[PDB]
């Protein structure tokens, strides 16, 4: 007999059979799209979809800017960035019509949160580009470096505490004739801090730069985070009030959203008509969305806001429409016969004849030459590089889904939007008019700059579809990928690690749809890892070690052994119901009075989110 796994589908629905096909949600160790080649490919692709639009030279930085917006309509079915401003404005106006006061309320709430926000908030993000060192540094490090270098230039806004003064200094530093900062140099070497100086144009290029990532493939500097924060806050305020928006949702309410959408569409179907659902994918979502369109969206949303907030919101799309892409480390040229290798950096890409690059890189460089600045950076005016305006893009998509009709035809469409992922539903009288509605939606999306994937999107009668890796079929719901718990311990301390692990399992079974058996197995595996790492096996086990020798004696001495902590060789009493209770609190009633006193000794020398009870196990490591 030859085992065929796929035959499982003959007996089980494919939705249930392909549950959790990927045990991870992060980037694997092999599928890494990083490098100068990938950045150049992204630039060439982004400009390829906008090369039928305007092209000019930037009076501020001198880059070659390409503007597809308000360009000619497409004549084929290739990705297009030529979104029409009037169509976008009409979609947004109808979206405002359907939700009175939503734009105004979102603008006011975002403005108030901005007025309350503080500079310390620009430290909870991921790595950020640092112009002072021209390198990716953690948000706090980059923020502190920027604050110090601003103090060097007589720009003191971070001291006031408010985020608005800091952003004001960020945008006023662009007008300084020349900016002085502290640069860390490996001057044997040593990271010495020196007073370096750059000119206005170089600083402007550095502020608009987005470095490539190595460990989203592009990272932004600190100059744009303050404004992207408020823009995304406004977008989220708009999105949380849209029934089509499904990005903020997560957990068991995502299934509720899917079920509600399906039921709502089914109930409104014409008697005797047909309802179809399109599982949709967007092609080149990031490479075909223009920051100019987002500037227009923010302008329309904040129409009735005070002008100061309108400008504050416009700053971010303004800075991303004039962005510069740093192309990375460069390429590597080697001599096989001489057994030599050398890395050509980005500034020196064209310093050698293109015949010395392989064919694909040669063509890439030939296409990149027009937009290549003579510093190792390229100009990327069109497109949205990677996830930076997810909420705003979801708003645009939902606005596309709100038209509901073209030419007053015999079909009505709705859907769900999660940024670049979407589901469409079409109610009509027969499949022919349903496909007519799907075609009209495809054309409207093209007009808006959104490019539905024909090679990936498909259709079938309502009652079965997929949204954001979640398969829905006749009410039953499954997940394609699940980030199963990593292996090891948090590494804080044996008292906290148990709480962190149990909370991880609890949140996995709350949000990620982990089942009872899977969660119990995860508890078992975590306890195994805990006992391995902290050398705290059971006191009745046969395990040799420095701490285990005394754990065995503690086991023998104690009477209420079920009250001992796992770190003390006691039994594990964690199950599904009590994952939210600290183990000290759980075992308090069973603890021996002497062991409980020693463990809960307020004067012990060791102590000196998650819920934990301080004790001899809440120690510290240098």
């Amino acid at each position: 007999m030859n085992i065929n796994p796929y035959f499982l589908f003959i007996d089980v629905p494919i939705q249930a059979a392909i549950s959790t096909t990927f045990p991870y949600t992060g980037v694997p160790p092999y599928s890494h799209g990083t490098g100068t080649g990938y950045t150049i490919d992204t630039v060439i692709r982004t400009h390829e979809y906008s090369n039928k639009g305007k092209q000019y030279i930037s009076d501020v930085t001198g880059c070659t800017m390409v503007d597809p917006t308000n360009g000619p309509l497409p004549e084929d079915n290739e990705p297009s960035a030529y979104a029409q401003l009037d169509c976008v404005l009409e979609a947004l106006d109808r979206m405002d019509e359907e939700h009175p006061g939503l734009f105004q309320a979102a603008s006011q709430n975002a403005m108030e949160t901005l007025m309350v926000t503080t500079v310390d908030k620009l430290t909870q993000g991921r790595q950020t580009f640092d112009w002072t060192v021209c390198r990716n540094q953690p948000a706090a490090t980059a923020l502190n470096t920027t604050i110090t270098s601003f103090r060097l230039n007589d720009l003191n806004g971070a001291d006031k505490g408010g985020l608005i003064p800091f952003c004001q200094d960020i945008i006023d530093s662009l007008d300084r004739p020349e900016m002085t900062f502290f640069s860390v140099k490996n001057i044997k070497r040593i990271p010495m801090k020196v007073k370096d100086k750059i000119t206005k144009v170089e600083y402007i290029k550095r502020a608009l730069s987005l470095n490539t990532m190595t460990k989203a493939i592009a990272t932004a500097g600190i100059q744009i985070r303050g404004f992207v924060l408020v823009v995304e806050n406004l977008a989220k305020n708009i999105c949380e009030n849209l029934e089509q928006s499904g990005l903020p949702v997560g957990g068991n309410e995502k299934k509720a959203k899917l079920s509600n959408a399906v039921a709502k569409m089914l109930s409104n179907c014409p008697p005797g008509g047909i309802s179809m659902t399109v599982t949709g994918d967007n092609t080149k979502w990031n490479e075909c969305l223009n920051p100019r369109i987002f500037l227009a969206m923010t302008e329309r949303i904040t129409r009735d806001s005070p002008i100061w907030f309108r400008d504050f919101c416009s700053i971010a799309p303004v800075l991303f429409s004039n962005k510069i892409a740093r192309l990375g480390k460069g390429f590597m040229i080697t001599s096989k016969t001489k057994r030599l290798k050398a890395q050509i950096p980005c500034p020196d890409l064209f310093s050698i004849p293109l015949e010395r690059y392989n064919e694909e890189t040669r063509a890439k460089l030939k296409k990149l030459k027009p937009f290549f600045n003579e510093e190792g950076t390229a100009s990327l005016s069109p497109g949205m590089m990677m996830g930076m305006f997810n909420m705003l893009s979801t708003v645009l998509g939902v606005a596309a889904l709100g038209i509901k009709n073209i030419g007053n035809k015999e079909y009505l469409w709705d859907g769900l939007q999660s940024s670049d992922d979407f589901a469409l539903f079409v109610n009509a009288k027969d499949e022919e008019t349903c496909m007519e509605g799907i075609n009209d939606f495809y054309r409207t999306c093209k007009l808006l700059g959104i490019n539905m994937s024909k090679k990936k999107s498909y259709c079938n009668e309502t009652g079965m579809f997929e949204f954001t890796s979640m398969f829905y079929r006749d009410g039953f719901v499954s997940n394609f990928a699940m980030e199963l718990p990593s292996f090891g311990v948090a590494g804080v301390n044996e008292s906290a690690d148990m709480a962190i692990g149990m909370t991880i399992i609890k949140n996995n079974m709350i949000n990620n749809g982990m089942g009872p058996a899977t969660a119990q197995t995860a508890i078992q595996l975590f306890i195994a890892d805990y006992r391995y790492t902290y050398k705290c096996h059971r006191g009745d086990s046969k395990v040799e070690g420095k701490r285990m020798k005394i754990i065995k004696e503690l086991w023998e001495n104690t009477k209420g052994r079920d009250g001992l902590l796992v770190a003390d060789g006691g039994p594990n009493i964690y199950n599904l119901r009590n994952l939210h209770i600290p183990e000290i609190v759980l075992k308090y009633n069973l603890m021996d009075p002497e062991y409980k006193g020693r463990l809960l000794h307020p004067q012990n020398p060791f102590v000196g989110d998650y819920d934990a009870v301080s004790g001899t196990h809440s120690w510290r490591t240098k």
């Binding site: 068991n252 299934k255 079920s259 039953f476 719901v477 292996f487 090891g488 311990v489 948090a490 590494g491 804080v492 044996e494 609890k506 949140n507 079974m509 709350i510 749809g513 089942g515 890892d529 790492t533 902290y534 050398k535 059971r538 009745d540 420095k546 701490r547 020798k549 005394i550 004696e553 503690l554 023998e556 003390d568 599904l576 119901r577 009590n578 994952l579 939210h580 209770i581 600290p582 609190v585 759980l586 009075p593 002497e594 062991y595 006193g597 020693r598 809960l600 000794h601 307020p602 004067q603 012990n604 020398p605 060791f606 819920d611 009870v613 001899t616 120690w619 510290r620 490591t621 240098k622």
Partner: protein, 613 residues
């Protein structure tokens, strides 16, 4: 960027923990039994003393005992959470398509494709007696139902059940309250209970009308034919459910009137749904668009009426949708309720709330009903009033310690209390067990304690375990003298019928594993975390609860070698001869020809040699 590996390495270091300075910090000995707890090093400028995790272990073992008064006060929220969890009641888990006290349990309550019913508790301590009584009765009913002749097992267990310190019979005769389970147990013990018709949680008392059951084939919404006994004629009952009451007037496959009073929303919903299901309205039958195949804990199929009851309790909307609606009159006393049990004139068809208080039927009606084999109670007139199907499925922990002095209930242990009870039972009856064993009679293996023990032996290996144990015991008895410790250890496994292989010999084992492994195993030739014995001190440590073994031992069963009763069919011979080879695996031992020799390692430092008979 790898905290797990970093911490694993740090714990493998010598003194990775920072230590404070003070009297208590100086109470840690420099080294304990050769283990360096604290470094005897003076930092140049920091003066930072370090210690090993073994120092924390030593502090928790022998360190000074601090005062632990007011600890619960500081961490009051966590203890309140634990109290809420412990006092909660668990309902049923349903598959297919919020107070802050519920969001805590969200992980265990709501799933993507399942839902768990959860009633939070806390500080419901006043009526501990009745709560414990109902818990005990429900557990007894559940145990007896899965057994042939449930009545006999239920009556046998109920007599040996004690709540706190008073026998269950005394509590049943005194409290007079309880639920369907309490009434069933009372009527099983020969006590008297109140006379009420039962349908699930619904208590019915007819006050006018007559009915006659007619067998019929009815069609349901899902499109299936079901054989049901329908009630014909006009009948009127006083209905009650928890804290709600009312009057139900019904006819053949139709609910005419349903007057009720305001009460708890959930209780009112249950009352209304049960009344609809009992009315046998065809409008109710047509609302079944799912699958009704619900079974019981015995594994049998529920009767159609209880099938519909369970279905509609799980899916209430499927009935309210296909129940129609009407407009109630504007009378002050009269009202109406929607699908959400609110104040709305758009009320359900045939259901109406009322202001006037409806007198309860719960008058003193103590009577002596008759109980059949399957825990069904029947009047002197021959009409079944209640049954096992009406027992509530809610589960909770008793507020008073209940003890069932009977092995039949041992299955409700943790596989360690079951082993504890079984081995204590062997030890207590050791003299009589051995006296009976040394007579050629083997009925001892059929005792109820071994019945409970078999519930934790893997079904796949239970036969092999029993065969091995029986062969070892027979070898210890007939062809050689007995060892008491091995007899005690291997007696409980003898219950299952032998599953000897085709060779005519038992399966040899090094360990016997039980449910929930890791540490739940019995070493056939060595001490185990669940069963250990001291050959010289005559101490039998079962789960660390050392029990003396003086007197029951014999003088002749000390000089004998442990290797005489470690493998079936093998008798110790010679000594540790390093010529046959290494310690043979069990696989070679079964494959060894009769009369051959083999080498064994009883434990770390006790090699022996054996010969097949």
């Amino acid at each position: 960027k790898n905290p797990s590996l970093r911490m694993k390495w740090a714990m493998c270091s010598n003194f990775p923990l920072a230590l404070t300075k003070g009297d208590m910090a100086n109470r840690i000995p420099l080294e304990y039994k050769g283990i360096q707890l604290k470094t005897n090093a003076e930092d140049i400028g920091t003066k930072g003393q370090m210690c090993s995790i073994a120092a924390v272990t030593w502090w928790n073992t022998y360190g000074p005992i601090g005062d632990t008064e007011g600890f619960e006060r500081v961490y009051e929220s966590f203890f309140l959470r634990k109290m809420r969890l412990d006092n909660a009641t668990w309902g049923r888990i349903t598959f297919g398509p919020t107070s802050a006290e519920f969001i805590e349990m969200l992980h265990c309550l709501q799933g993507e494709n399942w839902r768990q019913i959860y009633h939070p508790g806390g500080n419901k301590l006043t009526e501990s007696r009745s709560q414990s009584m109902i818990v005990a009765c429900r557990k007894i009913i559940r145990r007896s139902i899965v057994a042939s002749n449930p009545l006999e097992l239920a009556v046998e267990i109920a007599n040996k059940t004690v709540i706190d310190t008073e026998p269950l019979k005394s509590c049943l005769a005194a409290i007079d309250g309880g639920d369907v389970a309490c009434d069933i147990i009372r009527a099983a013990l020969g006590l008297k209970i109140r006379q009420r018709q039962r349908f699930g949680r619904l208590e019915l008392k007819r006050i006018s009308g007559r009915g006659f059951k007619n067998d019929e084939e009815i069609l349901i919404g899902n499109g299936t034919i079901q054989k049901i006994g329908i009630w014909d004629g006009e009948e009127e009952f006083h209905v009650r459910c928890g804290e709600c009451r009312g009057i139900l007037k019904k006819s053949k496959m139709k609910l005419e009137k349903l007057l009720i009073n305001s009460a708890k929303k959930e209780d009112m919903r249950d009352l209304i749904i049960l009344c609809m299901v009992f009315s046998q309205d065809t409008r109710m039958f047509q609302g079944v668009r799912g699958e009704i195949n619900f079974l019981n804990r015995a594994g049998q199929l529920l009767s159609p009426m209880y099938q519909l009851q369970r279905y509609f309790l799980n899916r209430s909307n499927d009935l309210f949708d296909q129940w129609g609606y009407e407009e109630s009159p504007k009378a002050s006393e009269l009202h109406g309720i929607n699908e959400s049990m609110n104040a709305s004139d758009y009320t359900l068809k045939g259901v109406v709330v009322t202001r006037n208080v409806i007198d309860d039927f719960s008058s003193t009606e103590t009577e002596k009903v008759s109980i059949t084999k399957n825990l069904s109670l029947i009047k002197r007139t021959g009409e079944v009033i209640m049954g096992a199907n009406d027992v509530s499925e809610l589960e909770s922990q008793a507020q008073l310690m209940i003890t069932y002095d009977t092995p039949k209930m041992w299955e409700m242990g943790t596989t360690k209390e079951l082993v504890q009870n079984t081995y204590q039972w062997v030890l207590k009856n050791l003299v009589t067990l051995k006296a009976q064993f040394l007579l050629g009679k083997e009925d001892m293996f059929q005792w109820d304690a071994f019945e409970a023990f078999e519930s934790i032996i893997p079904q796949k290996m239970a036969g092999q375990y029993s065969g091995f144990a029986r062969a070892v015991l027979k070898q210890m008895r007939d062809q050689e003298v007995m060892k008491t410790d091995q007899f005690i250890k291997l007696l409980p496994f003898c219950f299952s019928p032998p599953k000897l292989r085709s060779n005519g010999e038992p399966y040899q084992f090094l360990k016997l594993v039980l449910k929930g492994g890791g540490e739940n195993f019995i070493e056939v030739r060595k001490g185990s975390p669940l069963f250990s014995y001291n050959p010289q001190t005559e101490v039998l440590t079962i789960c660390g609860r050392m029990m003396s073994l003086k007197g029951k031992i014999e003088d002749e069963e000390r000089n004998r070698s442990m290797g005489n009763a470690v493998l079936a069919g093998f008798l110790v011979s010679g000594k540790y001869d390093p010529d046959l080879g290494d310690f043979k695996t069990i696989e070679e031992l079964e494959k060894l020809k009769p009369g051959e020799k083999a080498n064994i390692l009883l434990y770390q430092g006790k090699p022996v040699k054996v010969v097949k008979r």
